[PDB]
Amino acid sequence: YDIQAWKKQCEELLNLIFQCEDSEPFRQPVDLLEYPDYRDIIDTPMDFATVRETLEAGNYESPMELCKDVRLIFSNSKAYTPSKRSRIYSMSLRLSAFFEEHISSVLSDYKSALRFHKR
Numbered sequence: 869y870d871i872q873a874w875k876k877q878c879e880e881l882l883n884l885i886f887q888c889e890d891s892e893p894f895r896q897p898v899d900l901l902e903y904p905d906y907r908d909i910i911d912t913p914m915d916f917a918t919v920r921e922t923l924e925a926g927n928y929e930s931p932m933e934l935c936k937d938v939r940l941i942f943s944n945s946k947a948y949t950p951s952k953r954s955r956i957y958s959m960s961l962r963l964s965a966f967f968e969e970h971i972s973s974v975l976s977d978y979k980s981a982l983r984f985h986k987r
Protein backbone atom coordinates (compact mmCIF):
# COMPACT_ATOMS: atom_id res chain seq x y z
CA TYR A 869 0.00 0.00 0.00
CA ASP A 870 2.89 2.39 -0.68
CA ILE A 871 1.31 5.26 -2.74
CA GLN A 872 4.79 6.45 -3.90
CA ALA A 873 6.33 3.08 -4.90
CA TRP A 874 5.29 3.39 -8.55
CA LYS A 875 7.93 6.03 -9.27
CA LYS A 876 11.05 3.91 -8.66
CA GLN A 877 9.22 0.94 -10.33
CA CYS A 878 8.77 3.14 -13.44
CA GLU A 879 12.42 4.32 -13.33
CA GLU A 880 13.54 0.66 -13.28
CA LEU A 881 11.16 -0.24 -16.14
CA LEU A 882 12.47 2.75 -18.19
CA ASN A 883 16.05 1.52 -17.54
CA LEU A 884 15.10 -1.94 -18.94
CA ILE A 885 13.41 -0.28 -21.94
CA PHE A 886 16.54 1.83 -22.71
CA GLN A 887 18.76 -1.35 -22.66
CA CYS A 888 16.22 -3.13 -24.97
CA GLU A 889 17.42 -2.98 -28.59
CA ASP A 890 13.76 -2.55 -29.65
CA SER A 891 13.67 0.90 -28.00
CA GLU A 892 16.31 2.35 -30.38
CA PRO A 893 13.83 4.28 -32.66
CA PHE A 894 11.99 5.69 -29.60
CA ARG A 895 14.78 6.84 -27.25
CA GLN A 896 14.77 10.48 -28.40
CA PRO A 897 12.24 12.73 -30.20
CA VAL A 898 11.65 11.84 -33.88
CA ASP A 899 14.11 13.84 -36.04
CA LEU A 900 12.21 16.12 -38.44
CA LEU A 901 15.19 16.21 -40.83
CA GLU A 902 14.86 12.37 -41.12
CA TYR A 903 10.98 12.45 -41.37
CA PRO A 904 10.03 15.89 -42.73
CA ASP A 905 6.23 15.48 -42.65
CA TYR A 906 6.17 13.87 -39.19
CA ARG A 907 4.19 16.77 -37.63
CA ASP A 908 1.59 16.69 -40.45
CA ILE A 909 0.53 13.23 -39.21
CA ILE A 910 1.50 13.19 -35.51
CA ASP A 911 -0.09 15.82 -33.25
CA THR A 912 1.75 14.95 -30.06
CA PRO A 913 5.24 13.56 -30.42
CA MET A 914 6.50 11.44 -27.54
CA ASP A 915 9.67 9.45 -26.79
CA PHE A 916 11.28 7.59 -23.84
CA ALA A 917 13.77 10.39 -22.98
CA THR A 918 10.84 12.84 -22.62
CA VAL A 919 8.99 10.29 -20.44
CA ARG A 920 12.07 9.75 -18.25
CA GLU A 921 12.67 13.51 -17.96
CA THR A 922 9.00 14.11 -17.04
CA LEU A 923 9.23 11.44 -14.35
CA GLU A 924 12.54 12.77 -12.96
CA ALA A 925 11.22 16.35 -12.91
CA GLY A 926 8.36 15.19 -10.62
CA ASN A 927 5.83 16.02 -13.35
CA TYR A 928 3.86 12.75 -13.30
CA GLU A 929 1.35 12.44 -10.45
CA SER A 930 0.53 8.76 -11.12
CA PRO A 931 1.78 5.77 -13.17
CA MET A 932 -1.41 6.09 -15.28
CA GLU A 933 -0.08 9.43 -16.63
CA LEU A 934 3.29 7.81 -17.47
CA CYS A 935 1.47 4.87 -19.08
CA LYS A 936 -0.62 7.30 -21.27
CA ASP A 937 2.62 8.91 -22.59
CA VAL A 938 4.34 5.53 -23.19
CA ARG A 939 1.23 4.28 -25.09
CA LEU A 940 1.36 7.51 -27.15
CA ILE A 941 4.92 6.52 -28.32
CA PHE A 942 3.45 3.27 -29.67
CA SER A 943 0.30 4.82 -31.17
CA ASN A 944 2.43 7.48 -32.93
CA SER A 945 4.62 4.69 -34.36
CA LYS A 946 1.48 2.88 -35.62
CA ALA A 947 -0.02 6.04 -37.13
CA TYR A 948 3.26 6.98 -38.89
CA THR A 949 3.94 3.50 -40.34
CA PRO A 950 3.31 2.98 -44.10
CA SER A 951 2.84 -0.77 -43.49
CA LYS A 952 2.10 -3.00 -40.46
CA ARG A 953 5.28 -4.95 -41.46
CA SER A 954 7.76 -2.02 -41.17
CA ARG A 955 10.95 -2.38 -39.03
CA ILE A 956 10.18 0.47 -36.61
CA TYR A 957 6.52 -0.52 -36.16
CA SER A 958 7.47 -4.19 -35.62
CA MET A 959 9.88 -3.01 -32.86
CA SER A 960 7.13 -0.87 -31.29
CA LEU A 961 4.80 -3.93 -31.19
CA ARG A 962 7.34 -6.05 -29.31
CA LEU A 963 8.33 -3.19 -27.01
CA SER A 964 4.64 -2.48 -26.28
CA ALA A 965 4.09 -6.14 -25.26
CA PHE A 966 7.15 -5.96 -22.95
CA PHE A 967 5.98 -2.63 -21.46
CA GLU A 968 2.36 -3.80 -20.88
CA GLU A 969 3.59 -7.04 -19.29
CA HIS A 970 5.66 -5.05 -16.77
CA ILE A 971 3.42 -2.01 -16.14
CA SER A 972 0.36 -4.09 -15.18
CA SER A 973 1.54 -4.79 -11.59
CA VAL A 974 2.75 -1.18 -11.19
CA LEU A 975 -0.71 0.11 -12.04
CA SER A 976 -2.49 -2.50 -9.93
CA ASP A 977 -0.30 -1.85 -6.87
CA TYR A 978 -0.73 1.91 -7.17
CA LYS A 979 -4.54 1.75 -7.60
CA SER A 980 -4.76 -0.70 -4.66
CA ALA A 981 -2.63 1.59 -2.45
CA LEU A 982 -4.77 4.61 -3.35
CA ARG A 983 -8.00 2.69 -2.60
CA PHE A 984 -6.48 1.70 0.79
CA HIS A 985 -5.54 5.33 1.47
CA LYS A 986 -9.11 6.47 0.80
CA ARG A 987 -10.81 3.50 2.62
Ligand SMILES: CCn1cc(CNC(=O)c2cccnc2)cn1
Nearest residue numbers: 893898944945948949950954956
Ligand atom coordinates in the same frame (compact mmCIF):
# COMPACT_ATOMS: atom_id res chain seq x y z
C1 LIG B 1 10.62 6.72 -35.04
C2 LIG B 1 9.94 7.44 -36.22
N1 LIG B 1 9.00 6.53 -36.91
C3 LIG B 1 9.22 5.95 -38.14
C4 LIG B 1 8.13 5.17 -38.41
C5 LIG B 1 7.91 4.34 -39.63
N2 LIG B 1 7.71 5.23 -40.76
C6 LIG B 1 8.55 5.25 -41.86
O1 LIG B 1 9.50 4.48 -41.98
C7 LIG B 1 8.20 6.25 -42.89
C8 LIG B 1 9.18 6.82 -43.72
C9 LIG B 1 8.83 7.87 -44.57
C10 LIG B 1 7.48 8.30 -44.56
N3 LIG B 1 6.51 7.75 -43.79
C11 LIG B 1 6.87 6.73 -42.97
C12 LIG B 1 7.24 5.30 -37.29
N4 LIG B 1 7.80 6.15 -36.36
